[PDB]
Amino acid sequence: VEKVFFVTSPIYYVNAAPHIGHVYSTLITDVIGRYHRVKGERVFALTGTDEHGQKVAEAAKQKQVSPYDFTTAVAGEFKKCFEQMDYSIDYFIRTTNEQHKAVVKELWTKLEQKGDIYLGRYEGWYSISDESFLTPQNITDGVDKDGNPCKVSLESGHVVTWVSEENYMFRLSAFRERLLEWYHANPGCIVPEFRRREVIRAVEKGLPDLSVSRARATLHNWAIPVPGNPDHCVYVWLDALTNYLTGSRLRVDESGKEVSLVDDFNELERFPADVHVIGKDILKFHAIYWPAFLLSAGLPLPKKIVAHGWWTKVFDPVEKAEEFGYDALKYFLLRESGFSDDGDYSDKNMIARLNGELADTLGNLVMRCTSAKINVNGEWPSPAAYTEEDESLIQLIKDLPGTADHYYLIPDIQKAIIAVFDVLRAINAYVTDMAPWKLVKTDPERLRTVLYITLEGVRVTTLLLSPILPRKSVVIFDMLGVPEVHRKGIENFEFGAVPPGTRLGPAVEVLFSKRST
Ligand code: MET
Known part of the structure; x- marks a missing residue:
């Protein structure tokens, strides 16, 4: 649909x-x-x-x-x-x-x-800070901003107060079976899984009806009135x-x-x-x-x-x-x-990831494949025949969009990032093994192939990283000279979507600057 x-x-x-x-x-x-x-x-x-x-x-x-x-x-x-x-x-x-x-x-x-709404009472605990009704099992002893003894929530630690009000009640108890059917028929509806299980255990234990209105004085008259009853406000x-x-x-x-x-x-x-x-x-x-x-x-x-x-x-x-x-x-x-x-x-770890992943892995690779030393024509070259090592890397790049897609859809953005960077690490390894800097003098035909795979790997990884690095992705594509049309759309998830002969963008200039350890 x-x-x-x-x-x-x-x-x-x-x-x-x-x-x-x-x-x-x-x-x-x-x-x-x-x-x-x-x-x-x-x-x-x-x-x-x-x-x-x-x-x-x-x-x-x-x-x-x-x-x-x-x-x-x-x-x-x-x-x-x-x-x-x-x-x-x-x-x-x-x-x-x-x-x-x-x-x-x-x-x-x-x-x-x-x-599904009736007039009743709520008599019980409430956390104003969480706007949450709590049962006695969810409270314990603690302290208020003063330091006086009081009751507090187990959920959050904020102060709780007892409330005794005539309120409009929602018949939540009547929805337990249907909610359980929903969770079981749609086992991916709550992520992550251990939180899904938590919800199910809770609903299994039983559900009380829920107060959906409060007396207007209680909310300092700062709320939506209940239709047909100005004395009550709708639960926030x-x-x-x-x-x-x-x-x-x-x-x-x-x-x-x-x-x-x-x-x-x-x-x-x-x-x-x-x-x-x-x-x-x-x-x-x-x-x-x-x-x-x-x-x-x-x-x-x-x-x-x-x-x-x-x-x-x-x-x-x-x-x-x-x-x-x-x-x-x-x-x-x-x-x-x-x-x-x-x-x-911490700053230590921020810098560690900045330097290690963003600069060393991603940024370094971008400069390598766009460098005047290595990419002497400033263009996407036309690859020659592929070795098994070429094809191993290509396979990873081809498989990446499907893998990243599934992660994004879970959704699990951490895993999507890790998947892309696994491929970026692999491209760096390839580049280190092929030593394209040496190939410029030794084997130009071979360099075409190496450079092309590298460029394409960078484009594809960058495309899948564009939701995480929206500005830097644009800078990267500009350097690679990727036309706008190829920066979007599932068609461009595919390997080889940018044809050889595409010219790189002009150079000026770092992508990610490293920082003092
Ligand atoms: C419908 S989402 C409400 C969230 C709530 N206002 C909070 O800040 O926690």
Whole structure:
């Protein structure tokens, strides 16, 4: 089914300035979106801000300014950050948007009509910071900003409070069987696998109904009213999760502003999401609540939720990008960490990867095959006959796109990078064995073959690395003189797509500059 590939980030609470957490989540969303655009697919990537709720309102009250002013300002800080980071997100959604609120009301009303929302009570624990209902098994003893004894969440460590409110309740308990059927029929719907298993174990244990409204005083009147009941506000999470639906329904102009909300999601061919990128801290809301709501409303379910290893709720990414380069930092963040906190994020390791992989492996190779000493005609040469060693390298280059494609689709961007760099290491080894610098004087016919394979390997690896290194990839292709048309599209994943006789671009000038150890 040819639709628009729909990839999302979470929408971030505006209680606080943007930091690495949000940058990382949105980076992953951006990389996926970029890969599918490189593949030649229609893409709509979404990110944004989560602006209502008790947590934000109390942050605004702490800074002594109105919630409207506060949210608008911080939303601006997030936008500025994502421009600075040079993402290619198609739209930035804010839950304060009137068209978003409209959608929330439509969805709420649908749930109510299907009989899945009733008036009840929630009596139990709540983490305002996580906007999360917790059971007594999920709390323990801790301390508040003072240092007084209190209760805190086991999930997150933030303070919990007991809540006793008459609330509108969603009949989540009724969706346990269908959610379990969903997880089992779609065993790749949650990545990584151990997080999928975690969700299943949880839903197996049983599901309580879920409070989807709060008394308006509690949220300092900073939330969406419940349709037909002004005394209640819609739970920030139902509000927040609904952004995905809203985004799927907005026509957006070339400038990036929302201009229209379509009635039927199918008009824009985005819903449901093909990939929801989230942090591990909000898995339950996306893998349990969200699909339960969609099941109630008869809406289609997302294909994949990928939950990465860091919590999204001192290390300044803009500052490090100014120091080491933007693409470099992006490469590091995506290469250093798989689905764990077990990444080494120090300057030592940043420089180690910068010098070792980016400069020594990739950059060095680019200069070798474009060098005036080795590539004396400044062109793609026409290869002669291939040796078995030539063919071994060629096979790797041919196999690479299929391998990288699967990884990007899991999605597992770390493994995609590793796969490309395995081939880059192999090309370097080949170049070292063939010693093309010596062949310029000794065997020009042989050099043609060696140089051509090298150039082609570099092009193909660069193409598959272009979602990770969007700017540097362009520089590389410019050096190789690859025409624009060949920088995109699955047809150009194939070996030999750039014909011999193509001229290299002019030289000026380093690709990645190494740094003091
Ligand atoms: C619908 S995604 C909501 C995410 C939440 N606002 C957070 O920052 O953790």
